[PDB]
Amino acid sequence: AMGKCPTKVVLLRNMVGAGEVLEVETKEECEKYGKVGKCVIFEIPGAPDDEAVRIFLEFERVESAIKAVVDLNGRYFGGRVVKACFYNLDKFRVLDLAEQV
Structure with missing residues (x-):
């Protein structure tokens, strides 16, 4: 599963x-782990409420x-x-943000 492989990008x-609508607020909260390059909020218009x-x-x-x-995780x-x-x-990087993890 893609989700298990360590990278610089957290989902x-x-x-x-x-x-x-958070992008600035979550980014600010996650500064405790280290410098955040960027933050993207992506909404799946389906969609189960815990995956939307x-x-x-x-x-x-x-x-970081x-x-x-x-x-x-689990919080x-x-x-x-x-x-x-x-x-x-x-x-x-190509904004393919709907992949299975």
Whole structure:
């Protein structure tokens, strides 16, 4: 599974439903793990409520991404259980953000 392979890009699922609108706020929260290159919120218009909103964080170093996944996977956030994993760097760069993880 793509989600298990360590990269600089972290995918956060089930952090919020559709919607609200966060990119600056999540990015600011994830600075504790290290420098964040960018943050992309992608909404799948399907879609199960715990998979509708994908939040991507590209860290400047892989160390920061790993720390974030370990710290946030399984975390309780406003009644929701967050799923954190890695995402393929190449897929992220061409904005192919709907891949199975």
